RNA sequence: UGAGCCUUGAUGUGUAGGAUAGGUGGGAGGCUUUGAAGUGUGGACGCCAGUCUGCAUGGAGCCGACCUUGAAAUACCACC
C-alpha cells in the first residue's frame, strides 16, 4: 500500500438500475431515486433549493431538484433509470432533461398519476 | 522463533518450529539454521515487560559486553557540533551528516554503534533524515546520543551495543556469533541484563524480561529460556 | 450485534518514485529442498510502467548498498 488517491478509485455498490419517481406537485416538485423494488435510496427537492411555494412550483426549480437527486444516489452505483411522474405540477420534463444531464441514462418515461372512475369530491384551490 | 517469507527460504529445511529451548540446545540449533556461507553475527532479541509508549519512559542507554559479537568495529558518527576528528581517530570509519547517511547504507552493514551528537539529531530524524527511522540509525528522541563523540566511538570499538524501545517490547542487540558455546552466550546476555536494569525506567515491570531469543543473520531465530534474575518462563 | 488487548495471516503513513521507507534494533548475497531473482500471469496493493504474493519457472540460482524516489533507503533477519 501507497498513500491513498486524491479522488475515489472505487464505489461501494453497483446495482446499475433504478427508477426516478417524480411528484411534480401543484406547489413544488420532489424527485426521489429508488431501487427497482421501490425502496428509496436518496431524494431532493425544488423547495429545499431556497424556494417557497411561489418559486418551488416551476420547471426551473424542478430542473434543480433532479440534479440534487442524481447526486443523492451516486454511491449506490445506479446509472440507468426509467422515469415515473405524478401530480399536476410542471416538474415533468425540464426535471428529466437535467436528470439525464447529471450523468444518468434514461430509457423510458411513463405516467403514474392515478385517474378515477368518477371517485371522491376534489380538493379546492382559489375556491374552484 | 523462525518465520517463513518468500525473500529467504533456505531456513525451512534447517528449522521447523516456533519453539523455546534451553540456551545449551538453542545455540546448537542456531548453527543449523545459519544460512550464510560465512559464520554469521548473532543477536539476542530481548522482549520486556515495559508498558511505556512515551520515549522518555522507555528504556534507553548503551553498554559494553565481556565478549565479542562478530561486528566489524567500523563506527559512524552524525555530527555538525562535536569533535569529528577525535571521533574518527577513536576508531570510527565514517563521519558526516549530508552524505554519512549514504556511507552507512553501503558496503558492510555491521556497525557496533551509529552515533549522533544532539548537535546533529535535527537532521538525523526530525526535519532532515539520514537513514529513515530503523534500528541502525541513532534514535531521534531518546538518549542514545552524546556531544562527546570521541568517547562514544572508543566505547563502541569495545564491542558495545545500543538499546532502546518505543511502542513495542523490543530491544535487539548483537550478542555473539553463531559458533558460540552457550556459556559465552549466556555471559553476554547477563552483561546486557545488568545494563537494562541500571538504565531501567520507572514504567517497566518487576518481571522486567518477557522473553529472550537468539537469531543469526541470513538465518532464522529460535527462542531461549534464559533471562536469569528476571525470566517469566521460570 | 458493539468494542478492546494480543497472537497470527494479509497489510504498512513522511509524499513520490518502476514500486510498498510502521516502529525498534541487528545485519547482508544464499542451496538439498527449493526460489525468491526474473519473465509471464492470476491475486493483492496501486501510480498506468512495479512490488508484494502464489504458480509456470531458475533450482551450481538470486533482489543491497551503485542507481533511484526523497530530508533520508531499499539482500535479509527478530520483535511488537
SS (H, E, C) B175-226: EEECCCCHHHHHHHHHHHHHHHHCCCCCCEEEEEEEEEEEEECCCCEEEECC
CA of B28 to C1' of C31 (A): 21
Q: Which residues pair with B171 in a beta bridge?
A: B46
Minimum-distance nucleotide, CA of B129 to C1' = C72
The answer to the question of residue A1 being in a domain is: no
Minimum-distance nucleotide, CA of B6 to C1' = C36
By CB neighbour count within 10 A (0-12 exposed, 13-18 middle, 19+ buried), where does A62 fall?
buried
CA of A72 to C1' of C21 (A): 41
CA of B177 to C1' of C20 (A): 32
The answer to the question of residue A55 being in a domain is: yes
CA of B115 to C1' of C23 (A): 19
CA distance B178 to B16: 18
Minimum-distance nucleotide, CA of B103 to C1' = C65
CA of A97 to C1' of C10 (A): 48
The answer to the question of residue A2 being in a domain is: no
The answer to the question of residue A117 being in a domain is: yes
What resolution in angstroms does the PDB record give? 13.2
The answer to the question of residue A30 being in a domain is: yes
The answer to the question of residue A113 being in a domain is: yes
Minimum-distance nucleotide, CA of B44 to C1' = C78
The answer to the question of residue A6 being in a domain is: no
The residue lying closest to nucleotide C51, measuring its CA against C1', is A1
CA distance B36 to B29: 15
CA distance B119 to B122: 8
φ/ψ of A125, rounded to 5, equals: -130, 135
CA distance B68 to B157: 10
C-alpha cell at B202: 520507572
CA of A5 to C1' of C42 (A): 25
The strand pair at A105-111 and A78-86 is best described as parallel
Give nucleotides in strand C with any atom < 7 A to a protein C-beta.
7-9, 11-17, 19-37, 45-47, 52-54, 63-66, 68, 71-80
Helix (H) or strand (E) holding A99: helix A94-100
Strand order in the sheet with A16-24: A40-45, A29-34, A16-24, A78-86, A105-111
Q: Which of B143, B161, B144 is closest to B45 using CA atoms?
A: B161
User: Domain range for residue A111?
Assistant: 13-128
The strand pair at B94-96 and B60-64 is best described as unpaired
For residue B81, count other CB atoms closer than 10 A to its CB: 12
**H-helix segments, chain B:** 23-30, 84-89, 100-103, 121, 149-156, 182-197
CA of A4 to C1' of C16 (A): 12
Domain count, chain A: 1
SS3 B115: strand
CA distance B95 to A10: 49
The answer to the question of residue A4 being in a domain is: no
DSSP state of B79: -
DSSP E strands, A25-70 = 29-34, 40-45
Amino acid at each position: 500500500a501507497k498513500a491513498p488517491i486524491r479522488a475515489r478509485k472505487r464505489v461501494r455498490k453497483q446495482v446499475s438500475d433504478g427508477v426516478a419517481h417524480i411528484h411534480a406537485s401543484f406547489n413544488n416538485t420532489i424527485v426521489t431515486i429508488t431501487d427497482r423494488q421501490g425502496n428509496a435510496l436518496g431524494w431532493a427537492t425544488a423547495g429545499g433549493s431556497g424556494f417557497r411555494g411561489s418559486r418551488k412550483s416551476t420547471p426551473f426549480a424542478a430542473q434543480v431538484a433532479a440534479e440534487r437527486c442524481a447526486d443523492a444516489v451516486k454511491e449506490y452505483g445506479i446509472k440507468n433509470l426509467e422515469v415515473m411522474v405524478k401530480g399536476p405540477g410542471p416538474g415533468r420534463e425540464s426535471t428529466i432533461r437535467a436528470l439525464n444531464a447529471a450523468g444518468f441514462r434514461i430509457t423510458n418515461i411513463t405516467d403514474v398519476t392515478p385517474i378515477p372512475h368518477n371517485g371522491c369530491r376534489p380538493p379546492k384551490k382559489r375556491r374552484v | 522463533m523462525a518465520k517463513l517469507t518468500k525473500r529467504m527460504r533456505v531456513i525451512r529445511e534447517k528449522v521447523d518450529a516456533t519453539k523455546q529451548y534451553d540456551i545449551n540446545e538453542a545455540i546448537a540449533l542456531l548453527k543449523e539454521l545459519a544460512t550464510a556461507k560465512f559464520v554469521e553475527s548473532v543477536d539476542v532479541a530481548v522482549n520486556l515487560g515495559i508498558d511505556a509508549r512515551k520515549s522518555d519512559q522507555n528504556v534507553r542507554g548503551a553498554t559494553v559486553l565481556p565478549h565479542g559479537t562478530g561486528r566489524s568495529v567500523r563506527v559512524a558518527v552524525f555530527t555538525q557540533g562535536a569533535n569529528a576528528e577525535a571521533a574518527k581517530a577513536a576508531g570510527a570509519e565514517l563521519v558526516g551528516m549530508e552524505d554519512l547517511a549514504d556511507q552507512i547504507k553501503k558496503g558492510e552493514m555491521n556497525f557496533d554503534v551509529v552515533i549522533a551528537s544532539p548537535d546533529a539529531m535535527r537532521v538525523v530524524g526530525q526535519l532532515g533524515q539520514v537513514l529513515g527511522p530503523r534500528g541502525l540509525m541513532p534514535n531521534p528522541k531518546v538518549g542514545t546520543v552524546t556531544p562527546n563523540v570521541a568517547e562514544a566511538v572508543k566505547n563502541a570499538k569495545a564491542g558495545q551495543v545500543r538499546y532502546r524501545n518505543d511502542k513495542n517490547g523490543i530491544i535487539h542487540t548483537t550478542i555473539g556469533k553463531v559458533d558460540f558455546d552457550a556459556d559465552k552466550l549466556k555471559e553476554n546476555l547477563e552483561a546486557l541484563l545488568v545494563a537494562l536494569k541500571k538504565a531501567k525506567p520507572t514504567q517497566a515491570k518487576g518481571v522486567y524480561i518477557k522473553k529472550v531469543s537468539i537469531s543469526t543473520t541470513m538465518g532464522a531465530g529460535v527462542a531461549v529460556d534464559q533471562a536469569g534474575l528476571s525470566a517469566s518462563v521460570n
